[PDB]
Design an enzyme around this catalytic site. Structure first.
Site, PDB file in Angstrom:
ATOM      1  N   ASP A  31     -19.736 -34.450 -39.802  1.00 13.70           N
ATOM      2  CA  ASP A  31     -22.128 -34.831 -39.501  1.00 13.70           C
ATOM      3  C   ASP A  31     -21.928 -34.002 -38.423  1.00 13.70           C
ATOM      4  O   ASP A  31     -21.623 -34.824 -37.040  1.00 13.70           O
ATOM      5  CB  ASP A  31     -21.740 -36.250 -39.427  1.00 13.70           C
ATOM      6  CG  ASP A  31     -22.724 -36.561 -39.487  1.00 13.70           C
ATOM      7  OD1 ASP A  31     -23.535 -36.165 -39.860  1.00 13.70           O
ATOM      8  OD2 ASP A  31     -22.554 -38.191 -39.406  1.00 13.70           O
TER       9      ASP A  31
ATOM     10  N   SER B   4     -38.160 -24.863 -36.526  1.00 19.63           N
ATOM     11  CA  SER B   4     -38.794 -24.019 -37.841  1.00 19.63           C
ATOM     12  C   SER B   4     -40.069 -23.230 -37.526  1.00 19.63           C
ATOM     13  O   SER B   4     -40.845 -23.371 -37.242  1.00 19.63           O
ATOM     14  CB  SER B   4     -38.790 -24.869 -39.208  1.00 19.63           C
ATOM     15  OG  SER B   4     -38.868 -23.727 -40.001  1.00 19.63           O
TER      16      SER B   4
END
Length: 330
Positions: A35, A199
Protein backbone atom coordinates in the site's frame (compact mmCIF):
# COMPACT_ATOMS: atom_id res chain seq x y z
CA UNK A 1 20.71 -5.69 -3.28
CA UNK A 2 17.39 -6.08 -5.04
CA UNK A 3 14.10 -7.91 -4.61
CA UNK A 4 11.37 -9.00 -7.01
CA UNK A 5 7.97 -10.42 -6.04
CA UNK A 6 4.85 -11.28 -7.97
CA UNK A 7 1.65 -9.53 -6.92
CA UNK A 8 -1.68 -11.25 -7.60
CA UNK A 9 -5.25 -9.92 -7.76
CA UNK A 10 -7.38 -11.19 -4.86
CA UNK A 11 -10.46 -11.70 -7.02
CA UNK A 12 -11.83 -11.45 -10.56
CA UNK A 13 -12.33 -7.67 -10.26
CA UNK A 14 -8.79 -6.74 -9.17
CA UNK A 15 -10.23 -5.37 -5.91
CA UNK A 16 -6.73 -5.52 -4.40
CA UNK A 17 -3.42 -7.29 -4.92
CA UNK A 18 -1.52 -9.59 -2.59
CA UNK A 19 2.22 -10.20 -2.48
CA UNK A 20 3.89 -12.97 -0.47
CA UNK A 21 6.15 -11.76 2.35
CA UNK A 22 8.44 -13.89 4.54
CA UNK A 23 8.40 -12.93 8.24
CA UNK A 24 10.51 -14.47 10.97
CA UNK A 25 12.77 -17.46 11.43
CA UNK A 26 11.87 -19.99 10.17
CA UNK A 27 9.97 -17.98 7.58
CA UNK A 28 6.23 -17.50 7.98
CA UNK A 29 4.82 -16.46 4.61
CA UNK A 30 1.87 -14.06 4.70
CA UNK A 31 0.12 -12.48 1.71
CA UNK A 32 0.19 -8.73 2.25
CA UNK A 33 -1.48 -5.81 0.48
CA UNK A 34 1.36 -3.50 -0.59
CA UNK A 35 0.00 0.00 0.00
CA UNK A 36 1.79 3.11 -1.26
CA UNK A 37 -0.87 5.14 0.57
CA UNK A 38 0.08 4.10 4.11
CA UNK A 39 3.20 3.40 6.15
CA UNK A 40 2.49 0.54 8.58
CA UNK A 41 3.43 -3.11 8.04
CA UNK A 42 0.76 -4.92 10.06
CA UNK A 43 -0.34 -8.54 10.12
CA UNK A 44 -3.03 -10.84 11.37
CA UNK A 45 -1.39 -12.71 14.20
CA UNK A 46 -1.70 -15.16 17.07
CA UNK A 47 -2.69 -12.06 19.12
CA UNK A 48 -5.67 -11.13 16.92
CA UNK A 49 -9.06 -11.45 18.63
CA UNK A 50 -10.17 -14.93 17.59
CA UNK A 51 -13.65 -13.92 16.38
CA UNK A 52 -11.98 -11.40 14.05
CA UNK A 53 -9.92 -14.03 12.21
CA UNK A 54 -11.73 -15.84 9.38
CA UNK A 55 -9.37 -17.71 7.07
CA UNK A 56 -6.32 -15.43 7.12
CA UNK A 57 -2.83 -16.75 7.65
CA UNK A 58 -1.43 -15.48 10.95
CA UNK A 59 2.03 -14.48 12.14
CA UNK A 60 2.97 -16.18 15.41
CA UNK A 61 5.92 -14.30 16.89
CA UNK A 62 6.50 -16.92 19.61
CA UNK A 63 7.50 -19.36 16.82
CA UNK A 64 10.08 -16.96 15.37
CA UNK A 65 13.55 -17.11 16.91
CA UNK A 66 14.32 -13.62 15.58
CA UNK A 67 11.14 -11.93 16.86
CA UNK A 68 11.51 -9.42 19.68
CA UNK A 69 8.72 -7.51 21.38
CA UNK A 70 9.22 -3.78 20.88
CA UNK A 71 8.59 -2.83 24.48
CA UNK A 72 5.78 -0.36 25.07
CA UNK A 73 5.00 0.17 21.39
CA UNK A 74 1.45 0.21 20.09
CA UNK A 75 -0.18 1.14 16.81
CA UNK A 76 -3.62 2.07 15.56
CA UNK A 77 -4.62 3.00 12.04
CA UNK A 78 -7.74 4.06 10.20
CA UNK A 79 -7.98 3.98 6.43
CA UNK A 80 -9.88 6.10 3.92
CA UNK A 81 -12.45 3.36 3.38
CA UNK A 82 -13.40 3.44 7.06
CA UNK A 83 -11.57 0.24 8.01
CA UNK A 84 -9.11 0.03 10.91
CA UNK A 85 -6.78 -2.13 12.97
CA UNK A 86 -4.54 -1.86 16.03
CA UNK A 87 -2.16 -3.81 18.24
CA UNK A 88 1.40 -4.11 19.51
CA UNK A 89 4.77 -4.37 17.77
CA UNK A 90 7.59 -6.82 17.21
CA UNK A 91 10.82 -6.44 15.31
CA UNK A 92 11.70 -9.37 13.07
CA UNK A 93 13.34 -10.34 9.80
CA UNK A 94 11.21 -9.55 6.76
CA UNK A 95 11.95 -10.58 3.19
CA UNK A 96 10.20 -9.61 -0.04
CA UNK A 97 11.18 -11.32 -3.24
CA UNK A 98 14.67 -12.14 -1.98
CA UNK A 99 15.34 -8.74 -0.35
CA UNK A 100 15.81 -9.02 3.41
CA UNK A 101 15.47 -6.41 6.16
CA UNK A 102 16.47 -7.29 9.70
CA UNK A 103 14.86 -5.45 12.60
CA UNK A 104 11.73 -4.50 10.63
CA UNK A 105 8.81 -3.34 12.74
CA UNK A 106 6.04 -5.92 12.32
CA UNK A 107 2.84 -4.57 13.78
CA UNK A 108 0.79 -7.41 15.23
CA UNK A 109 -2.98 -6.89 15.16
CA UNK A 110 -4.94 -7.38 18.35
CA UNK A 111 -8.06 -5.93 16.70
CA UNK A 112 -9.18 -5.56 13.09
CA UNK A 113 -12.38 -4.10 11.69
CA UNK A 114 -15.03 -6.16 9.95
CA UNK A 115 -13.88 -5.55 6.38
CA UNK A 116 -10.49 -7.06 7.18
CA UNK A 117 -12.04 -10.08 8.88
CA UNK A 118 -14.38 -10.56 5.93
CA UNK A 119 -11.51 -10.66 3.42
CA UNK A 120 -9.83 -14.03 3.90
CA UNK A 121 -7.27 -13.32 1.16
CA UNK A 122 -5.43 -10.41 2.82
CA UNK A 123 -3.17 -11.29 5.76
CA UNK A 124 -2.14 -7.69 6.44
CA UNK A 125 -0.71 -4.58 4.81
CA UNK A 126 2.81 -3.50 3.88
CA UNK A 127 2.97 0.28 3.77
CA UNK A 128 5.13 2.01 1.16
CA UNK A 129 4.24 5.68 1.74
CA UNK A 130 6.65 7.88 3.73
CA UNK A 131 7.59 6.83 7.24
CA UNK A 132 6.26 10.12 8.63
CA UNK A 133 2.79 8.51 8.42
CA UNK A 134 3.73 5.43 10.47
CA UNK A 135 1.39 5.11 13.46
CA UNK A 136 3.65 3.34 15.98
CA UNK A 137 3.75 5.09 19.35
CA UNK A 138 5.69 6.31 21.25
CA UNK A 139 8.55 5.69 18.79
CA UNK A 140 7.58 5.95 15.12
CA UNK A 141 8.92 3.15 12.95
CA UNK A 142 10.28 2.97 9.41
CA UNK A 143 8.72 1.29 6.41
CA UNK A 144 10.24 -1.76 4.77
CA UNK A 145 11.42 0.42 1.86
CA UNK A 146 12.92 3.02 4.17
CA UNK A 147 14.84 0.30 6.03
CA UNK A 148 16.03 -1.38 2.81
CA UNK A 149 16.85 1.75 0.86
CA UNK A 150 20.51 2.22 1.69
CA UNK A 151 21.26 -1.40 0.76
CA UNK A 152 19.45 -1.28 -2.58
CA UNK A 153 21.34 -0.99 -5.87
CA UNK A 154 19.18 2.09 -6.58
CA UNK A 155 16.82 3.71 -4.02
CA UNK A 156 13.63 2.84 -5.90
CA UNK A 157 10.77 0.44 -6.06
CA UNK A 158 8.42 -0.20 -8.97
CA UNK A 159 4.77 -1.24 -9.23
CA UNK A 160 3.66 -3.16 -12.30
CA UNK A 161 0.09 -4.19 -11.55
CA UNK A 162 -1.77 -6.46 -13.93
CA UNK A 163 -5.27 -6.19 -15.33
CA UNK A 164 -7.02 -9.41 -14.37
CA UNK A 165 -3.52 -10.92 -14.15
CA UNK A 166 -0.47 -11.08 -11.89
CA UNK A 167 2.13 -8.33 -11.89
CA UNK A 168 5.34 -7.42 -10.11
CA UNK A 169 6.83 -5.30 -7.33
CA UNK A 170 10.58 -4.74 -7.76
CA UNK A 171 12.92 -3.19 -5.23
CA UNK A 172 16.25 -1.64 -6.09
CA UNK A 173 16.16 -1.72 -9.90
CA UNK A 174 14.16 -0.72 -12.93
CA UNK A 175 13.33 -3.62 -15.28
CA UNK A 176 13.77 -1.99 -18.68
CA UNK A 177 11.95 -4.92 -20.35
CA UNK A 178 8.76 -4.25 -18.37
CA UNK A 179 7.56 -1.11 -20.18
CA UNK A 180 7.37 0.47 -23.61
CA UNK A 181 8.80 3.82 -24.65
CA UNK A 182 10.34 6.00 -21.95
CA UNK A 183 9.62 6.65 -18.31
CA UNK A 184 8.40 10.20 -17.66
CA UNK A 185 9.32 11.50 -14.23
CA UNK A 186 7.28 14.05 -12.34
CA UNK A 187 7.69 15.97 -9.07
CA UNK A 188 6.49 14.64 -5.72
CA UNK A 189 5.43 16.49 -2.60
CA UNK A 190 5.99 14.52 0.58
CA UNK A 191 4.28 17.17 2.73
CA UNK A 192 1.28 14.93 3.50
CA UNK A 193 3.39 11.76 3.69
CA UNK A 194 2.11 10.46 0.35
CA UNK A 195 3.50 9.96 -3.14
CA UNK A 196 1.67 13.13 -4.15
CA UNK A 197 2.06 14.52 -7.66
CA UNK A 198 0.24 16.66 -10.23
CA UNK A 199 -1.22 15.19 -13.39
CA UNK A 200 -1.24 17.54 -16.36
CA UNK A 201 -4.76 16.68 -17.53
CA UNK A 202 -7.06 14.12 -19.05
CA UNK A 203 -9.03 12.89 -22.04
CA UNK A 204 -12.16 10.76 -22.33
CA UNK A 205 -12.11 8.13 -25.07
CA UNK A 206 -10.94 9.59 -28.37
CA UNK A 207 -11.75 13.10 -27.16
CA UNK A 208 -9.40 16.05 -27.00
CA UNK A 209 -6.96 16.33 -24.12
CA UNK A 210 -7.88 18.87 -21.44
CA UNK A 211 -4.82 20.52 -19.93
CA UNK A 212 -5.50 21.00 -16.24
CA UNK A 213 -3.51 20.37 -13.07
CA UNK A 214 -4.84 17.50 -10.96
CA UNK A 215 -3.02 17.00 -7.65
CA UNK A 216 -3.37 13.48 -6.30
CA UNK A 217 -1.65 10.48 -4.77
CA UNK A 218 -0.25 7.31 -6.32
CA UNK A 219 -1.95 4.74 -4.09
CA UNK A 220 -1.63 1.03 -4.76
CA UNK A 221 -3.86 0.30 -1.75
CA UNK A 222 -6.91 2.01 -3.24
CA UNK A 223 -8.85 0.07 -5.87
CA UNK A 224 -10.41 2.86 -7.91
CA UNK A 225 -9.50 6.16 -9.56
CA UNK A 226 -10.92 9.11 -7.59
CA UNK A 227 -10.90 12.46 -9.41
CA UNK A 228 -12.67 15.85 -9.23
CA UNK A 229 -16.41 15.78 -9.84
CA UNK A 230 -16.06 17.82 -13.04
CA UNK A 231 -13.69 15.24 -14.57
CA UNK A 232 -15.76 12.25 -13.45
CA UNK A 233 -18.98 13.78 -14.82
CA UNK A 234 -17.27 14.36 -18.17
CA UNK A 235 -16.25 10.70 -18.26
CA UNK A 236 -19.63 9.17 -17.37
CA UNK A 237 -21.50 11.53 -19.69
CA UNK A 238 -19.99 9.44 -22.51
CA UNK A 239 -21.70 6.27 -21.25
CA UNK A 240 -25.40 5.94 -22.11
CA UNK A 241 -27.46 5.39 -18.99
CA UNK A 242 -24.67 6.07 -16.50
CA UNK A 243 -25.72 7.94 -13.38
CA UNK A 244 -24.49 8.81 -9.93
CA UNK A 245 -26.40 6.77 -7.39
CA UNK A 246 -26.46 8.00 -3.80
CA UNK A 247 -27.93 4.67 -2.65
CA UNK A 248 -25.14 2.63 -4.27
CA UNK A 249 -22.45 5.17 -3.40
CA UNK A 250 -21.14 6.32 -6.76
CA UNK A 251 -21.48 6.17 -10.50
CA UNK A 252 -23.13 3.10 -11.95
CA UNK A 253 -23.69 2.17 -15.56
CA UNK A 254 -25.56 -0.43 -17.61
CA UNK A 255 -23.57 -3.65 -17.62
CA UNK A 256 -24.35 -3.85 -21.37
CA UNK A 257 -22.21 -0.75 -22.04
CA UNK A 258 -18.87 -0.60 -23.80
CA UNK A 259 -16.83 1.85 -21.70
CA UNK A 260 -14.57 4.50 -23.23
CA UNK A 261 -10.92 4.73 -22.26
CA UNK A 262 -9.59 7.42 -19.92
CA UNK A 263 -6.25 9.12 -20.47
CA UNK A 264 -4.27 10.99 -17.80
CA UNK A 265 -1.24 13.23 -18.30
CA UNK A 266 2.20 12.81 -16.79
CA UNK A 267 4.09 15.85 -17.95
CA UNK A 268 3.85 15.79 -21.75
CA UNK A 269 3.29 12.01 -21.67
CA UNK A 270 -0.06 10.21 -21.65
CA UNK A 271 -1.22 7.02 -19.90
CA UNK A 272 -4.30 5.36 -21.41
CA UNK A 273 -6.62 3.37 -19.14
CA UNK A 274 -8.64 1.02 -21.37
CA UNK A 275 -12.39 1.11 -20.87
CA UNK A 276 -12.53 -2.46 -19.58
CA UNK A 277 -10.30 -1.46 -16.63
CA UNK A 278 -13.12 0.84 -15.46
CA UNK A 279 -15.73 -1.98 -15.17
CA UNK A 280 -16.18 -3.25 -11.59
CA UNK A 281 -19.09 -5.48 -12.36
CA UNK A 282 -22.62 -5.86 -11.02
CA UNK A 283 -23.46 -3.79 -7.95
CA UNK A 284 -24.99 -6.93 -6.41
CA UNK A 285 -25.01 -10.49 -7.69
CA UNK A 286 -27.18 -10.81 -10.80
CA UNK A 287 -27.77 -7.06 -11.24
CA UNK A 288 -27.52 -5.44 -14.67
CA UNK A 289 -26.26 -2.23 -13.05
CA UNK A 290 -22.46 -2.19 -12.91
CA UNK A 291 -20.15 -0.17 -10.65
CA UNK A 292 -17.78 2.36 -12.18
CA UNK A 293 -14.04 2.38 -11.68
CA UNK A 294 -13.75 6.18 -11.91
CA UNK A 295 -15.48 7.94 -9.02
CA UNK A 296 -15.61 11.42 -7.54
CA UNK A 297 -13.08 12.45 -4.92
CA UNK A 298 -15.41 15.17 -3.65
CA UNK A 299 -15.53 14.84 0.10
CA UNK A 300 -12.43 12.62 0.23
CA UNK A 301 -10.32 15.75 0.31
CA UNK A 302 -7.73 14.34 -2.07
CA UNK A 303 -7.59 12.84 -5.56
CA UNK A 304 -6.41 9.24 -5.66
CA UNK A 305 -4.67 7.50 -8.53
CA UNK A 306 -5.55 4.01 -7.33
CA UNK A 307 -5.14 0.65 -9.01
CA UNK A 308 -7.44 1.49 -11.96
CA UNK A 309 -4.92 4.14 -13.02
CA UNK A 310 -1.68 2.55 -11.82
CA UNK A 311 -2.30 -0.81 -13.50
CA UNK A 312 -2.29 0.94 -16.89
CA UNK A 313 1.36 1.95 -16.25
CA UNK A 314 4.77 0.85 -15.11
CA UNK A 315 5.28 3.09 -12.07
CA UNK A 316 8.60 4.07 -10.48
CA UNK A 317 8.59 5.19 -6.86
CA UNK A 318 11.93 6.99 -6.72
CA UNK A 319 13.09 7.37 -3.13
CA UNK A 320 16.18 9.42 -3.87
CA UNK A 321 16.95 12.38 -1.58
CA UNK A 322 14.35 14.34 -3.53
CA UNK A 323 11.68 11.76 -4.35
CA UNK A 324 9.96 11.64 -7.73
CA UNK A 325 7.47 9.40 -9.55
CA UNK A 326 7.93 7.86 -12.98
CA UNK A 327 5.25 6.55 -15.33
CA UNK A 328 5.66 4.53 -18.53
CA UNK A 329 3.16 2.82 -20.78
CA UNK A 330 3.47 -0.97 -21.00
Amino acid sequence: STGSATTTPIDSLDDAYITPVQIGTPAQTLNLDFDTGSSDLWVFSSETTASEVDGQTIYTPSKSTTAKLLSGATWSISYGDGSSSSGDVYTDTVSVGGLTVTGQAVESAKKVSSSFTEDSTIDGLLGLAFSTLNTVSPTQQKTFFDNAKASLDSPVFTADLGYHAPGTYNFGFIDTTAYTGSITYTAVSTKQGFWEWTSTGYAVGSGTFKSTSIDGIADTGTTLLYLPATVVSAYWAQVSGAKSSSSVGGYVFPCSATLPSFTFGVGSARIVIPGDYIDFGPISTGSSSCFGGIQSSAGIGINIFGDVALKAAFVVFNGATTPTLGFASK
